[PDB]
């Protein structure tokens, strides 16, 4: 009935069929926000999954709407193996328990696994 509206802060190219493409400045209305870090959004003549990372809102552009860290950590387990790609990312194996310390909206959460701390995809994690 009254959809939130956001503004693309960079160009995005579709990698998959479900995705939508962006060009900087595009103004989208947001249909669904997934903790995955992918948001379903509509334009004129276009609708698809968009990385939330690539959006400012049209409200208070520089203020974050991310949660804030919980350095006590919260219990999660990996549902699917992921290999680190960047240096700040954490490789896990399916089934490993971790502690989530920051549920960033972008889909790349901060986690602690014993003596390694870093970024990991929220889509590949689950609660316990």
């Amino acid at each position: 009935i009254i959809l939130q509206t956001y503004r693309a802060i960079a160009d995005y190219e579709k990698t998959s069929g479900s995705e939508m493409a962006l060009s900087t400045g595009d103004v989208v209305e947001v249909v669904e926000k997934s903790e995955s870090g992918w948001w379903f959004c509509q334009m004129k003549g276009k609708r698809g999954w968009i990385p939330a990372s690539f959006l400012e809102p049209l409200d208070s552009p520089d203020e974050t709407e991310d949660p804030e860290p919980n350095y006590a950590g919260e219990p999660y387990v990996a549902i699917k193996a992921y290999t680190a790609v960047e240096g700040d990312e954490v490789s896990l194996l399916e089934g490993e328990a971790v502690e989530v310390i920051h549920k960033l909206l972008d889909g790349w959460w901060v986690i602690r696994k014993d003596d390694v701390t870093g970024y990991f995809p929220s889509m590949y994690l689950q609660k316990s």
């Binding site: 802060i9 995705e19 870090g37 990385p51 972008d106 790349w108 929220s122 889509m123 590949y124």
Partner: peptide
């Protein structure tokens, strides 16, 4: 949604 995670943030 897509089965791969999205990309890391840019800019």
């Amino acid at each position: 949604p897509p089965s791969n995670p999205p990309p890391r943030p840019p800019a």
